[PDB]
Every structure is written in C-alpha cells, then in structure tokens.
C-alpha cells in the first residue's frame, strides 16, 4: 500500500519552514529524509528526524531545494516530497492620491496578505485610512505624501529598508496619471543597486481624468512614433544619465518598455470605440487590462468585513435602507456650489428643483417609475446638504464620506443615478444612469457648452450617456 504527497513552498531568505511528513503517522518502523536537488543543505541529524527546520539562506539568485521523506509501517509506504524554493523577500508600495486606485489596492493588499504572509507593505492613500490595528493584520506601515505625490519620507523608508536586505524585489501600485510623479523618486536612487529589482508595476485610473488626457490627445500626429521616441528618455531619466523627463503621454503609458507593467483600464473598451486610440491599443498590447469590479464578492466573509470597515461602509445599513420600501432606489447626486456668484440657499434650492423634475410624472425628465429618494451630497456639501435634504422627508441620505466607487465595487449600486454631474458618473454602468446635470461654471454657460465639453464627448462615445441625457442648470 502506497501513499506519495508532493508540494511546493517559496520560502524567504532568513526565514523558517518547517519540513515534515505530509498526512502520515507520527511512528515508523523506519524512515528517512534526504535531499534530491540543490546546494546541500541537510545536516546529517534531520535525516532521521519526523519534522525539522529548514531555514532559507540568504543567496545571490533564488534557488530550489528538494527534499523527500520516506517512511514505512508494516501495511504502507508513505512519501512527502517537498521542493522549497528561497526567493528574496518583497516589498509592496502602494501610493495613491484618488480614490479608486487606493480601493482597488485595498482589495489587492486584503488578498495579498493571505497569499504573501511575510510581504511587507507601504502605503500612501490621501482618502483610505488605516488605523494601527488593521494596518498591523495586513502588515503595512503608513506614510504621508507630499502634497499628491510621492513623499522624501517614504523613499528614505524605502531606502533603508532595501538596505536592510541581501536582496529585494519591489513591486509598484499607484496611479496611472501621476506614476511619473510618484515612481521615478524611489527608483533613481534604487537604480544603480544590483540587489534591488522592480518586479512589478501595477498603474490604476484615476477616474474620467485619464480619459479626458487621452481625448484631448487622440489627434496628436504621429503619436505613438513620438511616444517610442520617449521610451529612451523614460529610460535614462530614470538611470540619472540625463536631468530630462518625457512630458505627456511619453511619461505615463511608456512603463510596460522598461518594467513588467499593467495598465488597468476603468474603461478598456475606450481604446476600442474611439478609433483615434487603435494605435495606442496596439503599443499597451497586453499589458492594457480592464479594471475589475466584482474581486470584493470574491473575497472571504471576513476579508470582506475587513475592507468594509477601513473604508468605512456599513453595507448591511444601506441594504436594509434599499428595502425598506419596495420601490426601486433613487441615488440623487448632490454638488456644493458652482458659478454666478450666489448665495447658498440657491445652489440647494436649485437641486431641489431638479429633484422635484425628476420625480414629478408631468415633466420631460421625470425618471420613468416611482422610486424611493436617497441623496448622495458633495463630501463638504454641508448646510446645502441639510437645505436638500430637509426639503424630502422620506429621502435617505447616503453619507458624503462614502464614495460612488465603493459603491460600485461592493455591488452596492442603485436601480438608478442622475443629479448634477461629475466624473462619478464615469464610473456607472449605463443602463444605471438616468440623467447627467450641469452647471454654469466658467466654462460651461449653457447645454450646447456641455455637450462639447470633453468630459461629455467620452461619455457620448462609451454610451453612458446618450445627448438626451444631459441637461443644463444655469
Ligand atoms: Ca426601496
């Protein structure tokens, strides 16, 4: 009777893995280990041993260790082999202005945490807060930014941190639009260290941002010529062999030359309708991914908890709140102020008026069914939000420190969205969308301003609005 069990470990320089039998019993009447692969390294006491300590060296390159256990009873043969492999451990850095990129890293570091045990974590989120507790179960250090950006703090952690180790591998997650504003500082001075590799960069959207910069530049001649022409200069930067940068797209969508790279894209498929971005699809290749909006369902019951509580979202209060009529659910999206110099009681009753529009059978934009009112109000909309809100008895609010993007990737999203709009709205699946509002600002004076508006155009040819969708409010 035969039993052989096989597996494999990774196993970081200075730290313990402990062989052992898999699945056997804990006496033999003989048994042994030995090893089959790699610089030798049993110590001739373990070959007799049931358990014991395999304890990673610290080595120039990763390097497998093989090792069988053979053990025999009167009735069975029993065989574990186990092949380690020593790596270099790894720090993951995650530096984020936004909110979407920072949620989406969240998911990332909840998951990785379970799958990387002994990966070390930094991170600068501007909007997600991590208090000592959760920052200790998911084994990250916080640091400040300067301002948006990339902070001297953290690259000096960064640094000391590298120096600490034989060897390391970094891997990068921040923003697609300011990546050269956030990576460049830690790599230059990281550059010229053998020891140390970027192993991975992981670049997030923003939010409708990146798409307006790429609108505004899908006419550029000869655009993407111009941009394999700045891969040198992306490149040399970063080496300190020159003080220039690339300025533009060159900085930004140029990594996947130099460093594995993901681009995850809020839209993807913009690089398929707008036909002015064929070329650029081409060039990401591979390394263009679609942003993903469904990991959070995926996770555990209490890794799900986890997330929800460092964001801050008491998803069941919302549900129970979504049920307790049944109606379909309404989210209006409220705004602070905008231009015409007015007092504040306007911006609010002027909300209100597209409100009542908005649910009143006899008007044009009526939303199509009856719905129960909840109100999402600018994170600073204050009295304007209490003025909106007192105005609808039965209306719920929704709490302004609860971005739409948590929403969306709770699964938390409503029947229907409409109100004044933002780039919020970008981020919304179509059929979700009623109505888009805007408002006189220095740019926009009236609807026909609003619909050139290069916000509107990408939306226009996305589909998440069609013209009919969107409204002025003077
Ligand atoms: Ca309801």
């Known amino acids: 009777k035969e039993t052989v069990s096989s597996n494999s470990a990774d196993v970081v320089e200075t730290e313990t893995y402990q062989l052992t039998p898999i699945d056997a019993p804990s006496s033999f009447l003989s048994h042994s280990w030995e090893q089959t692969?790699?610089?030798?390294?049993?110590?001739?006491?373990?070959?007799?041993?049931?358990?014991?300590?395999?304890?990673?060296?610290?080595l120039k390159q990763d390097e497998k260790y093989c090792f069988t256990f053979k053990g025999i009873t009167g009735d069975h043969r029993y065989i574990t082999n186990t092949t380690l492999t020593v790596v270099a451990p790894t720090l993951?850095?995650?530096?984020?202005?936004?909110?979407?990129?920072?949620?989406?890293?969240?998911?990332?570091?909840?998951?990785?945490?379970?799958?990387?045990?002994?990966?070390?974590?930094?991170?600068?989120?501007?909007?997600?807060?991590?208090?000592?507790?959760?920052?200790?179960?998911?084994?990250?250090?916080?640091?400040?930014?300067?301002?948006?950006?990339?902070?001297?703090?953290?690259?000096?952690?960064?640094?000391?941190?590298?120096?600490?180790?034989?060897?390391?591998?970094?891997?990068?997650?921040?923003?697609?639009?300011?990546?050269?504003?956030?990576?460049?500082?830690?790599?230059?001075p990281l550059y010229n260290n053998e020891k140390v590799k970027i192993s991975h960069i992981s670049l997030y959207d923003d939010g409708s941002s990146e798409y307006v910069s790429l609108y505004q530049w899908k006419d550029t001649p000869n655009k993407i010529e111009t941009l394999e022409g700045e891969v040198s200069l992306l490149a040399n930067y970063l080496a300190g062999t020159s003080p220039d940068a690339p300025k533009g797209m060159g900085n930004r969508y140029n990594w996947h030359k130099l460093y594995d790279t993901d681009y995850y894209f809020l839209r993807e498929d913009y690089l398929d309708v707008e036909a002015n971005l064929h070329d650029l699809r081409d060039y990401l290749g591979s390394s263009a991914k679609q942003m993903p909006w469904d990991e959070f369902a995926k996770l555990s019951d209490s890794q799900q908890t986890l997330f929800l509580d460092i964001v801050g979202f008491d998803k069941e209060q919302l549900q129970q709140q979504y049920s307790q009529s049944p109606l379909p659910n309404f989210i209006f999206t409220g705004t602070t102020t905008w231009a015409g110099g007015e007092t504040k009681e306007y911006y609010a009753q002027q909300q209100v008026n597209v409100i009542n529009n908005a649910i009143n059978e006899t008007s044009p934009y009526y939303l199509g069914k009856d719905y129960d009112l909840f109100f999402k109000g600018h994170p600073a909309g204050g009295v304007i939000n209490d003025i909106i809100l007192g105005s609808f008895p039965d209306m719920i609010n929704i709490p302004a420190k609860i971005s739409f993007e948590v929403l969306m990737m709770t699964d938390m999203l409503p029947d229907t969205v409409a109100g004044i709009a933002s780039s919020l709205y970008f981020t919304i699946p179509a059929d979700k969308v009623n109505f888009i509002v805007f408002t006189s600002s220095d740019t926009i004076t009236d609807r026909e301003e609003a619909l050139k508006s290069p916000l509107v155009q990408v939306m226009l040819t996305l589909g998440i609005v069609k013209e009919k969708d969107v409204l002025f409010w003077a």
């Not at 790699?38 to 041993?49: H, V």
């Not at 591998?169 to 923003?175: A, G, L, P, Q």
């Open 92 to 188: 993951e850095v995650y530096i984020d202005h936004a909110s979407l990129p920072s949620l989406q890293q969240l998911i990332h570091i909840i998951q990785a945490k379970d799958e990387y045990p002994s990966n070390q974590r930094f991170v600068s989120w501007k909007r997600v807060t991590v208090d000592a507790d959760n920052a200790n179960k998911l084994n990250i250090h916080t640091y400040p930014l300067k301002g948006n950006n990339t902070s001297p703090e953290m690259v000096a952690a960064i640094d000391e941190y590298a120096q600490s180790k034989n060897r390391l591998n970094i891997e990068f997650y921040t923003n697609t639009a300011h990546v050269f504003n956030n990576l460049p500082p830690i790599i230059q």
């Open 37 to 58: 692969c790699g610089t030798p390294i049993l110590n001739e006491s373990d070959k007799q041993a049931i358990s014991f300590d395999f304890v990673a060296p610290e």
